[PDB]
Amino acid sequence: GEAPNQALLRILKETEFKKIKVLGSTVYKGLWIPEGEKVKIPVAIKELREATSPKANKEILDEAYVMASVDNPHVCRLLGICLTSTVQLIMQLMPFGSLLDYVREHKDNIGSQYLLNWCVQIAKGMNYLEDRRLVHRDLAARNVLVKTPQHVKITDFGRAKLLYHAEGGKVPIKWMALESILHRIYTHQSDVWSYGVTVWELMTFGSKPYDGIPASEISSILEKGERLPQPPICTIDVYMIMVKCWMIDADSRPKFRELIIEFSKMARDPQRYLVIQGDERMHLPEEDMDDVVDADEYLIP
Numbered sequence: 001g002e003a004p005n006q007a008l009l010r011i012l013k014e015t016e017f018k019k020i021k022v023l024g025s026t027v028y029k030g031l032w033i034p035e036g037e038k039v040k041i042p043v044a045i046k047e048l049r050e051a052t053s054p055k056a057n058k059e060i061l062d063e064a065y066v067m068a069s070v071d072n073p074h075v076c077r078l079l080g081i082c083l084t085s086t087v088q089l090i091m092q093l094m095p096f097g098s099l100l101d102y103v104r105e106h107k108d109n110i111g112s113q114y115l116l117n118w119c120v121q122i123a124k125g126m127n128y129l130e131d132r133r134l135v136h137r138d139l140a141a142r143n144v145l146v147k148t149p150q151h152v153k154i155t156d157f158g159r160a161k162l163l164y165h166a167e168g169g170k171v172p173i174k175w176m177a178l179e180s181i182l183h184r185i186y187t188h189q190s191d192v193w194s195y196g197v198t199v200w201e202l203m204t205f206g207s208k209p210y211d212g213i214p215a216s217e218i219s220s221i222l223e224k225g226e227r228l229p230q231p232p233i234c235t236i237d238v239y240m241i242m243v244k245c246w247m248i249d250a251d252s253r254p255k256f257r258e259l260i261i262e263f264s265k266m267a268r269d270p271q272r273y274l275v276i277q278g279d280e281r282m283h284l285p286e287e288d289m290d291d292v293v294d295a296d297e298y299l300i301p
C-alpha cells in the first residue's frame with residue numbers, strides 16, 4: 001500500500017514555554033525552552049478557545065498530524081503539541097506575519113527580485129507537498145508566512161488531505177480550481193490553480209481576487225472563460241504563467257517543478273519580467289536573547 005509515517009509527535013509541558021503576547025483572536029507569540037537544553041525558540045502557539053467542542057479538537061489534531069509529517073524549508077512544520085485543558089499547537093514564530101499582510105503593508109518597498117523569489121519558494125513548498133502526495137486545498141497569500149523578507153513558508157494545513165472528494169464547509173471559492181467548485185475534485189493540479197491566484201495576489205500587492213463578485217457567480221464566470229486580469233507590474237511572460245495555472249484541463253496546467261524552473265529563470269533577470277516604479281532603490285530587512293535559536297537551526301533526531 002503506502003509507506004509508514006514515522007514522523008514524531010512531540011508532547012510539550014506547559015512550563016516549557018511562556019506566552020509573551022497575542023497575535024490573533026487565538027494565536028500567541030511565545031518562547032519555548034526545551035527541558036534542559038539551554039536554547040530559547042521564538043514560537044507561535046495556536047490554543048483552541050472553546051475546548052468543549054470535540055469536533056474542533058479533531059480539526060486541530062488533523063493539522064498537528066500534517067505539520068508533524070512535513071520537513072521542507074518552504075513548508076511550516078509543528079515543533080510539538082501541549083495537552084492542557086486546551087490543545088495548543090507550537091510552531092516556529094514567523095515574525096513578519098502573512099505574505100498577504102506584508103505585500104499590503106510594504107507595496108512601496110517590494111522589488112521584482114523579492115516577488116519572483118517568493119513565487120519560487122512557494123513553488124518549492126508545493127512541489128515538496130506533492131512529493132509527499134499531499135493536497136493543500138487552501139493555498140492563498142494569507143496562508144504563506146514570512147520568516148524574513150528573503151524567506152517564506154506555506155502554512156494552514158487545516159484542509160490538507162492525501163492522494164480527493166469532500167462534502168461541505170465554508171470554502172475559498174476565489175482560490176479554487178473549477179473542478180473543485182463543481183465536483184469537489186482536488187489534486188496537485190487544483191493546488192496549481194490556487195498557486196496562480198496566490199501569485200496574482202502578490203503581483204497586485206494583495207488585491208482581493210474578483211473583488212465585489214459574489215461567490216455564487218464565480219463558477220459561471222470561469223465556465224464563460226473569464227480569468228483574473230493581467231496585473232500592471234506583470235510582463236505577459238509572468239501573466240501567461242498565471243493564465244496556464246487557470247486552464248480547464250487540469251493536466252494542461254504547469255507542474256510545481258516547472259513553476260520553480262520558469263520563475264527561477266525569471267528571478268535571474270527580474271527587471272525583464274516585472275516592471276515596478278523605483279525597483280532599483282528597494283530595501284527591506286524578553287531580557288536575555290543570548291541562547292535564542294530560530295526553529296530552523298533547532299534539529300531533533
Ligand SMILES: */C=C\C(=O)Nc1cc(N(C)C)n2nc(C)cc2n1
Nearest residue numbers: 023027044076091092093094097155
Ligand atoms: C511555521 C509554523 C507557523 O505556521 N507559524 C506561525 C503560525 C501562525 N499562525 C497559525 C497564525 N502565525 N501567525 C503569525 C503572526 C506568525 C505565525 N507563525
